[PDB]
Each structure stands twice: as C-alpha cells, then as structure tokens.
C-alpha cells in the first residue's frame, strides 16, 4: 500500500475508543449497536472503499458516516437493518447505539419489572428467559 | 402514556380493524385468526363488571381461566383473576401490558430455591 500521513492511532466515535488501525468494515463493529452486516450496508451507502483501513480516512468521511449512521432511513438503510423496529413509545423505525442501547435495555427491563410479568422477574433475578433445559446446565456464574 | 406513537384516548377511540397493525407478530396473527366466542363472552362479562361499578371505585374483579387472552387496551383498568392451575392471581390491568397475554401475569410454578443433596 502507501503510508497515509493523517493516521489517527486512536479513534473516538460515539463514546468509544476504536482501534483505528483495524479494518474499517470491522472496527465499526467494535462499538455496541453495530455488528458486521450493518456497518457494511452503511459503508456501501457511505461511499468508502473497503480496501482502506479505519485510520486512513478523512473526517468528512467520518462525519458522513455518522450522518448516515444517525439518519438511517434518509440514506437508504431501510427498516430491517435497524436495531429497534417498533419501540414501546413511538414505534419509530430507528437505530439505537451504545449508550442508548444499554438505556433501552434497562428501559425494557424496568418496564417488565413494573409490568409484573413472567419475563420481568426473570430479568430481575438474572436467569434464563427462553425456557431452557437446565437439567445439566446452569454451571458457570451461579452461586 | 403512549404506545407506538398512539395515546390511550387515541387507542380506546380507535376501531377494531385499525388495532391489527399496531401489535406484535403473534398478536396481529391471532387477531387475523379472529377471536373465539368464549373470549367474546369474557369481554362481555368484563363490560358488565366495569360498567356497574361506582365511579370512585375500581371494578369488581372477574376471575378467569383463559390464559391465552390478548390483553386488549379496552380491558385496561379492570382487575382480573388469572388461573394458574391452583390460584386466581388478581392483576390490575395497567396500560403497560396491552401487547401481552394474561397468562404471563399469574406465574404458574413456584421458583426453585434449592436445598442440599442427601444420598445422591
């Protein structure tokens, strides 16, 4: 390759230290709320070649990535790559990232505790939720 | 309170056809399948028991077996006993549970709280 001279050895995108030397299509996965498929379908509309790394970029590319990344409907990331489809409050097809991700997980758990449902007491107790066969499991992390 | 961008007065004034896009996959699935006559009659007993109550007072609790009832938002504010095999658990239907079943509110078994092994 070449030696790109603007190489930030640390990236800071949305309250996350990103190892900027990693591949761009696999360093966006490092934050919560974005996986592998999702950052790829971002970059196919974020108009950055996959050949580059994550520290080889311009901030104009960074600001258009974060622009598409917070405006997922307006840049043709349609409503199945989204982290949350229909919220409890607004039902708005919208991506939810790391701080808001833990916030909305906490929101749903606090809701189901307040609901007094079969799920909410499991989530307060920290047990299995999807009806598992624990006749041989439940080993690591139980005391 | 708001559900899916729709309010409580907005939901309770909304028709039965337009509910069927505002729910989950199983719930829109079952409302496509169409409710049974038993659940119709249970909602009718809920109408009679929610109407005849004094205006300060919460309605008289109606007990029921049918754990597989979709909590319609029209039921919000009532008190329903849900049968989990042994005991009618009496739940006040708050508006936070309009997208769930009754059957999750009367938790059916008792949680395992271990002892100690004897002869294993």
């Amino acid at each position: 390759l070449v030696i790109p001279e603007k190489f930030q050895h640390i990236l800071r995108v949305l309250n996350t230290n990103i190892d900027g030397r990693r591949k761009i299509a696999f360093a966006i996965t490092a934050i919560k709320g974005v996986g592998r498929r999702y950052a790829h379908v971002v970059l196919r509309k974020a108009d950055i070649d996959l050949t580059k790394r994550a520290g080889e970029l311009t901030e104009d590319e960074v600001e258009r990535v974060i622009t598409i990344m917070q405006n997922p409907r307006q840049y043709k990331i349609p409503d199945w790559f989204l982290n949350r489809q229909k919220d409890v409050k607004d039902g708005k097809y919208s991506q939810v990232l790391a701080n808001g991700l833990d916030n909305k997980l906490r929101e749903d758990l606090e809701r189901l505790k307040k609901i007094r449902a079969h799920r909410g007491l499991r989530h307060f107790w920290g047990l299995r939720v999807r009806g598992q066969h624990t006749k041989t499991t439940g080993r690591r992390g139980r005391t | 309170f708001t559900y899916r961008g729709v309010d409580l007065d907005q939901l309770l004034d909304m028709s039965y056809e337009q509910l069927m896009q505002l729910y989950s996959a199983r719930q829109r699935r079952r409302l496509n399948r169409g409710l049974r006559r038993k659940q119709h009659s249970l909602l009718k007993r809920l109408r009679k028991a929610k109407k005849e109550a004094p205006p300060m007072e919460k309605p008289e609790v109606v007990k029921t077996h049918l754990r597989d009832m979709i909590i319609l938002p029209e039921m919000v504010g009532s008190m329903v006993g849900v049968y989990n095999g042994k005991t009618f658990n009496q739940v006040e239907i708050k508006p936070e549970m309009i997208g769930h079943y009754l059957g999750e509110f009367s938790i059916t078994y008792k949680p395992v709280k271990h002892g100690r092994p004897g002869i294993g």
């Binding site: - | 008190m79 005991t87 658990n89 009496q90 006040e92 009367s106």
Partner: peptide
Amino acid sequence: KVPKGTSSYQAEWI
C-alpha cells in the same frame, strides 16, 4: 410493595 390484588403466589415470585 405487594399489590392489593394478587395472591401470595406471585408475591413469592416477587
């Protein structure tokens, strides 16, 4: 903070 409605059963689930 047990509800005035429900039994001791769900309250043991609380």
